[PDB]
Amino acid sequence: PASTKGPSVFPLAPSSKSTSGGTAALGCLVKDYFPEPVTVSWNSGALTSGVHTFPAVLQSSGLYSLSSVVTVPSSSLGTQTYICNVNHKPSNTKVDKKVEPK
Amino acid sequence: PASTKGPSVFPLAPSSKSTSGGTAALGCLVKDYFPEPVTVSWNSGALTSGVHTFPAVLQSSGLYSLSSVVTVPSSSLGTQTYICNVNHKPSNTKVDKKVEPK
Amino acid sequence: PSVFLFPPKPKDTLMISRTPEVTCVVVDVSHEDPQVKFNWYVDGVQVHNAKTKPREQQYNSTYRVVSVLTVLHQNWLDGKEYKCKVSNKALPAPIEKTISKAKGQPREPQVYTLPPSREEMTKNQVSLTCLVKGFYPSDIAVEWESNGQPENNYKTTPPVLDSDGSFFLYSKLTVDKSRWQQGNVFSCSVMHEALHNHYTQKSLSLS
Amino acid sequence: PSVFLFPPKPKDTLMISRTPEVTCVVVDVSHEDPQVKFNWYVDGVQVHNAKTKPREQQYNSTYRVVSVLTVLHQNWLDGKEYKCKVSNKALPAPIEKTISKAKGQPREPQVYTLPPSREEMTKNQVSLTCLVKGFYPSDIAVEWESNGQPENNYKTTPPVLDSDGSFFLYSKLTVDKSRWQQGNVFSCSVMHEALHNHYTQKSLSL
């Protein structure tokens, strides 16, 4: 019956080994939607640098699945906050999801 | 009923953090025997230097209690191993006890 | 802010196939002013860049910035000098470091093989020695091989300044006494600027 | 700041004939900030002047008040910890530096002498080689001799860590191919803590 199914937004938390003043990587794993597309934009238009919105993959289930990641300092993991705006135009679904640590 | 009661041998540990090049002191606390005597040896006849087998004391319990100590390097705490041979002739009790850093 | 210059590895500049590089490391670049500017010079020329290549990182409570300059085997072998200039706003003046191969005419290394002492072949393992003397500069590389493969239980002493002013060292390969007796043949390969194709070789056996 | 402790020379602690010494060196002391004080501690004890003796400076524009302490071969060999405690006005706090000999079961060294290579028999000078391995700690003294007399033209590589946590090094004596031809006998002397009488001697000749 469903022509459309909104997507589920889960936080790929930064690596707890972190330190030194080094690189960390976080993200927003956008799982089990259909149909394409899924635009992923970060903090709503202001953190575009180092961002790689990966191509969607068709699960043996038939629902879609895209990983959306961003490299930022292992030193800005605490003050700033990282907000992934996954906008799903087909199902009219908008789910923001906070990416903060474990 | 008991004419005799063997003694308990416990290790007065130096330390396991040890190192530098100073003095450390270890030992064998021989507690709650009767009757006197308690001869105390170290490694069975070979480390007599710096050894002070303290006089036995009569606890308000009536059982005896002697401290048997030896000054050796803070630097030979790891390789000399230190073995205290507490031979209690009245109760026919011989308890060796290893003295070592916890 | 500290800066350390690192030269390419001895083999890198001896083999055209390898890639020799000069690395400039900067440690203790405060969290506040992480801006770091590199300027490279090859004999005082290139304030205007070159190959160059920086990256950026974070540590204890400071920053570490690495810049890498690929060099030309012959520029290095021809004694050219490489300058790394590190400018940081949190620095009174820029810090400059410079490196190159030691100055001096290149002397060919003499490589000799030395079998174990009679008094050692009474142990399960012996020592096969390879003497390399009279070379200059000290940049050099030593290796062992028995058959079409490397022997990995050996050690090389660091180079030592002889009375000559040339350099000498010893590499000690350790083999199961059983092998050395089976008539096996070993060989140490020495790589130096002064050797024909930057490489010579010597064999050692039990005959 | 700037303090640096130094251990005694290996040969000094192995023979009572010589006197070992822990040398505390402080660099870059200012003209307007001299007055350098010291304090030596052996395993805690001694806070008040022990048997020390420091003096002499002048440099590139700085100081360097080097203090020196007499060591007891036994004390050092047994591993007592020597602590130099410097104190300066132009210094934020009291700097420190300690040191004891490398810890670990000592291991007697194996000494082997090697003839010059056949291939080297083409030069006006040859190489007498002395191998020394299996020793721990790394403190070691190596010398050469000929029928009672000392050899000057020799060089010894520093201690290198082998696979088993032991050390090895090579000593190299340079001698006239003639002397080696005449059949003279050369000897490699090795001083180390684990050697019976702190000394062993190996010979080589044609």
PDB file of all heavy atoms in Angstrom, chain B residues 17-24 73-76 79, chain D residues 42-44 78-82 99-100 103-105:
ATOM      1  N   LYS B  17      57.253  -1.106  43.494  1.00  0.00           N
ATOM      2  CA  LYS B  17      57.602   0.052  42.679  1.00  0.00           C
ATOM      3  C   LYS B  17      59.091   0.371  42.856  1.00  0.00           C
ATOM      4  O   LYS B  17      59.713   1.004  42.001  1.00  0.00           O
ATOM      5  CB  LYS B  17      56.680   1.231  43.005  1.00  0.00           C
ATOM      6  CG  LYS B  17      55.210   0.887  42.734  1.00  0.00           C
ATOM      7  CD  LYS B  17      54.236   1.994  43.101  1.00  0.00           C
ATOM      8  CE  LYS B  17      52.802   1.548  42.823  1.00  0.00           C
ATOM      9  NZ  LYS B  17      51.791   2.590  43.152  1.00  0.00           N
ATOM     10  N   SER B  18      59.632  -0.070  43.992  1.00  0.00           N
ATOM     11  CA  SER B  18      61.060  -0.379  44.162  1.00  0.00           C
ATOM     12  C   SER B  18      62.133   0.616  43.692  1.00  0.00           C
ATOM     13  O   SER B  18      62.709   1.348  44.492  1.00  0.00           O
ATOM     14  CB  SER B  18      61.355  -1.749  43.531  1.00  0.00           C
ATOM     15  OG  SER B  18      61.119  -1.732  42.131  1.00  0.00           O
ATOM     16  N   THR B  19      62.391   0.609  42.386  1.00  0.00           N
ATOM     17  CA  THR B  19      63.646   1.092  41.786  1.00  0.00           C
ATOM     18  C   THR B  19      64.216   2.460  42.187  1.00  0.00           C
ATOM     19  O   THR B  19      63.476   3.399  42.491  1.00  0.00           O
ATOM     20  CB  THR B  19      63.566   1.072  40.249  1.00  0.00           C
ATOM     21  OG1 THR B  19      62.599   2.031  39.803  1.00  0.00           O
ATOM     22  CG2 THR B  19      63.165  -0.315  39.758  1.00  0.00           C
ATOM     23  N   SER B  20      65.551   2.511  42.175  1.00  0.00           N
ATOM     24  CA  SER B  20      66.405   3.711  42.175  1.00  0.00           C
ATOM     25  C   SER B  20      67.834   3.283  42.492  1.00  0.00           C
ATOM     26  O   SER B  20      68.608   2.946  41.591  1.00  0.00           O
ATOM     27  CB  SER B  20      65.932   4.806  43.140  1.00  0.00           C
ATOM     28  OG  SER B  20      65.345   4.266  44.316  1.00  0.00           O
ATOM     29  N   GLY B  21      68.171   3.302  43.776  1.00  0.00           N
ATOM     30  CA  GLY B  21      69.414   2.732  44.246  1.00  0.00           C
ATOM     31  C   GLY B  21      69.548   3.020  45.725  1.00  0.00           C
ATOM     32  O   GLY B  21      70.595   3.502  46.163  1.00  0.00           O
ATOM     33  N   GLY B  22      68.486   2.720  46.485  1.00  0.00           N
ATOM     34  CA  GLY B  22      68.429   3.051  47.894  1.00  0.00           C
ATOM     35  C   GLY B  22      68.268   1.832  48.759  1.00  0.00           C
ATOM     36  O   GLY B  22      68.376   0.719  48.280  1.00  0.00           O
ATOM     37  N   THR B  23      68.032   2.040  50.047  1.00  0.00           N
ATOM     38  CA  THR B  23      67.766   0.924  50.941  1.00  0.00           C
ATOM     39  C   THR B  23      66.294   0.658  50.891  1.00  0.00           C
ATOM     40  O   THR B  23      65.481   1.587  50.777  1.00  0.00           O
ATOM     41  CB  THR B  23      68.182   1.185  52.411  1.00  0.00           C
ATOM     42  OG1 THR B  23      69.593   1.343  52.466  1.00  0.00           O
ATOM     43  CG2 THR B  23      67.825   0.020  53.335  1.00  0.00           C
ATOM     44  N   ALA B  24      65.973  -0.627  50.953  1.00  0.00           N
ATOM     45  CA  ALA B  24      64.639  -1.109  51.269  1.00  0.00           C
ATOM     46  C   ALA B  24      64.778  -2.096  52.431  1.00  0.00           C
ATOM     47  O   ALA B  24      65.870  -2.598  52.695  1.00  0.00           O
ATOM     48  CB  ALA B  24      64.029  -1.805  50.039  1.00  0.00           C
ATOM     49  N   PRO B  73      69.607  -4.369  49.274  1.00  0.00           N
ATOM     50  CA  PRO B  73      69.365  -3.281  48.291  1.00  0.00           C
ATOM     51  C   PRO B  73      67.905  -3.095  47.768  1.00  0.00           C
ATOM     52  O   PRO B  73      67.213  -4.090  47.537  1.00  0.00           O
ATOM     53  CB  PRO B  73      70.303  -3.656  47.119  1.00  0.00           C
ATOM     54  CG  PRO B  73      71.400  -4.476  47.743  1.00  0.00           C
ATOM     55  CD  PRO B  73      70.737  -5.240  48.864  1.00  0.00           C
ATOM     56  N   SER B  74      67.467  -1.838  47.563  1.00  0.00           N
ATOM     57  CA  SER B  74      66.177  -1.522  46.914  1.00  0.00           C
ATOM     58  C   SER B  74      66.243  -1.917  45.439  1.00  0.00           C
ATOM     59  O   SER B  74      65.265  -1.811  44.677  1.00  0.00           O
ATOM     60  CB  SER B  74      65.871  -0.020  47.000  1.00  0.00           C
ATOM     61  OG  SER B  74      64.520   0.239  47.346  1.00  0.00           O
ATOM     62  N   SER B  75      67.433  -2.370  45.062  1.00  0.00           N
ATOM     63  CA  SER B  75      67.795  -2.732  43.697  1.00  0.00           C
ATOM     64  C   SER B  75      67.872  -4.248  43.450  1.00  0.00           C
ATOM     65  O   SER B  75      67.957  -4.682  42.297  1.00  0.00           O
ATOM     66  CB  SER B  75      69.156  -2.099  43.343  1.00  0.00           C
ATOM     67  OG  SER B  75      70.243  -2.954  43.728  1.00  0.00           O
ATOM     68  N   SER B  76      67.886  -5.039  44.525  1.00  0.00           N
ATOM     69  CA  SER B  76      67.816  -6.508  44.411  1.00  0.00           C
ATOM     70  C   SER B  76      66.448  -7.049  44.910  1.00  0.00           C
ATOM     71  O   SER B  76      66.318  -8.211  45.322  1.00  0.00           O
ATOM     72  CB  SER B  76      69.037  -7.223  45.073  1.00  0.00           C
ATOM     73  OG  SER B  76      69.122  -6.992  46.481  1.00  0.00           O
ATOM     74  N   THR B  79      65.152  -9.444  41.200  1.00  0.00           N
ATOM     75  CA  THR B  79      65.819 -10.703  40.808  1.00  0.00           C
ATOM     76  C   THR B  79      65.747 -11.729  41.964  1.00  0.00           C
ATOM     77  O   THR B  79      64.847 -12.544  42.005  1.00  0.00           O
ATOM     78  CB  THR B  79      67.361 -10.503  40.355  1.00  0.00           C
ATOM     79  OG1 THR B  79      68.194 -10.204  41.498  1.00  0.00           O
ATOM     80  CG2 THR B  79      67.511  -9.420  39.261  1.00  0.00           C
TER      81      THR B  79
ATOM     82  N   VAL D  42      71.979  10.111  47.173  1.00  0.00           N
ATOM     83  CA  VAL D  42      72.178   8.726  46.775  1.00  0.00           C
ATOM     84  C   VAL D  42      71.154   7.860  47.499  1.00  0.00           C
ATOM     85  O   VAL D  42      71.331   7.528  48.665  1.00  0.00           O
ATOM     86  CB  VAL D  42      73.611   8.230  47.132  1.00  0.00           C
ATOM     87  CG1 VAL D  42      74.633   8.965  46.295  1.00  0.00           C
ATOM     88  CG2 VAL D  42      73.903   8.461  48.603  1.00  0.00           C
ATOM     89  N   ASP D  43      70.081   7.501  46.807  1.00  0.00           N
ATOM     90  CA  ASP D  43      69.033   6.684  47.408  1.00  0.00           C
ATOM     91  C   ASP D  43      68.354   7.446  48.537  1.00  0.00           C
ATOM     92  O   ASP D  43      68.095   6.900  49.611  1.00  0.00           O
ATOM     93  CB  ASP D  43      69.620   5.377  47.949  1.00  0.00           C
ATOM     94  CG  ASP D  43      69.902   4.370  46.855  1.00  0.00           C
ATOM     95  OD1 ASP D  43      70.388   4.783  45.784  1.00  0.00           O
ATOM     96  OD2 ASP D  43      69.646   3.168  47.068  1.00  0.00           O
ATOM     97  N   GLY D  44      68.071   8.721  48.280  1.00  0.00           N
ATOM     98  CA  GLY D  44      67.421   9.550  49.271  1.00  0.00           C
ATOM     99  C   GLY D  44      68.379  10.316  50.165  1.00  0.00           C
ATOM    100  O   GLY D  44      68.411  11.549  50.132  1.00  0.00           O
ATOM    101  N   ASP D  78      75.726  -1.805  42.162  1.00  0.00           N
ATOM    102  CA  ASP D  78      74.559  -2.364  42.830  1.00  0.00           C
ATOM    103  C   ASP D  78      73.284  -1.619  42.429  1.00  0.00           C
ATOM    104  O   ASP D  78      72.170  -2.036  42.758  1.00  0.00           O
ATOM    105  CB  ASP D  78      74.735  -2.332  44.353  1.00  0.00           C
ATOM    106  CG  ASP D  78      75.798  -3.312  44.848  1.00  0.00           C
ATOM    107  OD1 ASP D  78      75.919  -4.417  44.284  1.00  0.00           O
ATOM    108  OD2 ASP D  78      76.502  -2.983  45.823  1.00  0.00           O
ATOM    109  N   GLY D  79      73.451  -0.506  41.721  1.00  0.00           N
ATOM    110  CA  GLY D  79      72.299   0.244  41.259  1.00  0.00           C
ATOM    111  C   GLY D  79      71.756   1.380  42.104  1.00  0.00           C
ATOM    112  O   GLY D  79      70.588   1.734  41.952  1.00  0.00           O
ATOM    113  N   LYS D  80      72.560   1.952  42.986  1.00  0.00           N
ATOM    114  CA  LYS D  80      72.064   3.060  43.792  1.00  0.00           C
ATOM    115  C   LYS D  80      71.682   4.220  42.871  1.00  0.00           C
ATOM    116  O   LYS D  80      72.327   4.452  41.846  1.00  0.00           O
ATOM    117  CB  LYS D  80      73.113   3.519  44.808  1.00  0.00           C
ATOM    118  CG  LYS D  80      73.267   2.600  46.009  1.00  0.00           C
ATOM    119  CD  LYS D  80      74.005   3.313  47.132  1.00  0.00           C
ATOM    120  CE  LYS D  80      74.128   2.452  48.373  1.00  0.00           C
ATOM    121  NZ  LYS D  80      74.659   3.228  49.531  1.00  0.00           N
ATOM    122  N   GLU D  81      70.632   4.949  43.236  1.00  0.00           N
ATOM    123  CA  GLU D  81      70.149   6.063  42.430  1.00  0.00           C
ATOM    124  C   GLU D  81      70.798   7.403  42.804  1.00  0.00           C
ATOM    125  O   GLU D  81      70.660   7.884  43.928  1.00  0.00           O
ATOM    126  CB  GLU D  81      68.631   6.139  42.572  1.00  0.00           C
ATOM    127  CG  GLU D  81      67.949   7.182  41.718  1.00  0.00           C
ATOM    128  CD  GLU D  81      66.484   6.865  41.503  1.00  0.00           C
ATOM    129  OE1 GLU D  81      66.068   5.730  41.821  1.00  0.00           O
ATOM    130  OE2 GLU D  81      65.749   7.741  41.008  1.00  0.00           O
ATOM    131  N   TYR D  82      71.504   8.000  41.845  1.00  0.00           N
ATOM    132  CA  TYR D  82      72.184   9.271  42.059  1.00  0.00           C
ATOM    133  C   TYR D  82      71.344  10.438  41.587  1.00  0.00           C
ATOM    134  O   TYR D  82      70.995  10.527  40.416  1.00  0.00           O
ATOM    135  CB  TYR D  82      73.533   9.244  41.346  1.00  0.00           C
ATOM    136  CG  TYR D  82      74.460   8.218  41.956  1.00  0.00           C
ATOM    137  CD1 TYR D  82      74.190   6.855  41.848  1.00  0.00           C
ATOM    138  CD2 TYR D  82      75.557   8.612  42.725  1.00  0.00           C
ATOM    139  CE1 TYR D  82      74.982   5.915  42.495  1.00  0.00           C
ATOM    140  CE2 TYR D  82      76.355   7.673  43.375  1.00  0.00           C
ATOM    141  CZ  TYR D  82      76.060   6.330  43.256  1.00  0.00           C
ATOM    142  OH  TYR D  82      76.834   5.407  43.917  1.00  0.00           O
ATOM    143  N   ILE D  99      69.536   9.069  38.000  1.00  0.00           N
ATOM    144  CA  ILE D  99      70.155   8.081  37.136  1.00  0.00           C
ATOM    145  C   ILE D  99      70.768   6.972  37.958  1.00  0.00           C
ATOM    146  O   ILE D  99      71.291   7.205  39.039  1.00  0.00           O
ATOM    147  CB  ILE D  99      71.270   8.714  36.286  1.00  0.00           C
ATOM    148  CG1 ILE D  99      71.887   7.666  35.358  1.00  0.00           C
ATOM    149  CG2 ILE D  99      72.331   9.309  37.196  1.00  0.00           C
ATOM    150  CD1 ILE D  99      73.076   8.169  34.542  1.00  0.00           C
ATOM    151  N   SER D 100      70.676   5.756  37.441  1.00  0.00           N
ATOM    152  CA  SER D 100      71.248   4.580  38.078  1.00  0.00           C
ATOM    153  C   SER D 100      71.701   3.753  36.893  1.00  0.00           C
ATOM    154  O   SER D 100      71.392   4.108  35.759  1.00  0.00           O
ATOM    155  CB  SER D 100      70.187   3.840  38.892  1.00  0.00           C
ATOM    156  OG  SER D 100      68.934   3.862  38.242  1.00  0.00           O
ATOM    157  N   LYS D 103      69.095  -1.363  34.556  1.00  0.00           N
ATOM    158  CA  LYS D 103      68.671  -2.475  35.389  1.00  0.00           C
ATOM    159  C   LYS D 103      68.548  -3.769  34.579  1.00  0.00           C
ATOM    160  O   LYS D 103      68.373  -3.737  33.357  1.00  0.00           O
ATOM    161  CB  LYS D 103      67.341  -2.127  36.061  1.00  0.00           C
ATOM    162  CG  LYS D 103      67.288  -0.694  36.561  1.00  0.00           C
ATOM    163  CD  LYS D 103      66.082  -0.424  37.459  1.00  0.00           C
ATOM    164  CE  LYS D 103      66.273  -1.012  38.860  1.00  0.00           C
ATOM    165  NZ  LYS D 103      65.118  -0.707  39.754  1.00  0.00           N
ATOM    166  N   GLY D 104      68.661  -4.902  35.262  1.00  0.00           N
ATOM    167  CA  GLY D 104      68.551  -6.167  34.570  1.00  0.00           C
ATOM    168  C   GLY D 104      69.707  -7.101  34.848  1.00  0.00           C
ATOM    169  O   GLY D 104      70.846  -6.669  35.035  1.00  0.00           O
ATOM    170  N   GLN D 105      69.409  -8.394  34.878  1.00  0.00           N
ATOM    171  CA  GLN D 105      70.409  -9.406  35.141  1.00  0.00           C
ATOM    172  C   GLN D 105      71.588  -9.172  34.233  1.00  0.00           C
ATOM    173  O   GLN D 105      71.430  -9.086  33.017  1.00  0.00           O
ATOM    174  CB  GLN D 105      69.836 -10.791  34.862  1.00  0.00           C
ATOM    175  CG  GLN D 105      70.893 -11.873  34.776  1.00  0.00           C
ATOM    176  CD  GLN D 105      71.374 -12.309  36.138  1.00  0.00           C
ATOM    177  OE1 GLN D 105      70.685 -13.045  36.843  1.00  0.00           O
ATOM    178  NE2 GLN D 105      72.559 -11.852  36.521  1.00  0.00           N
TER     179      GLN D 105
END
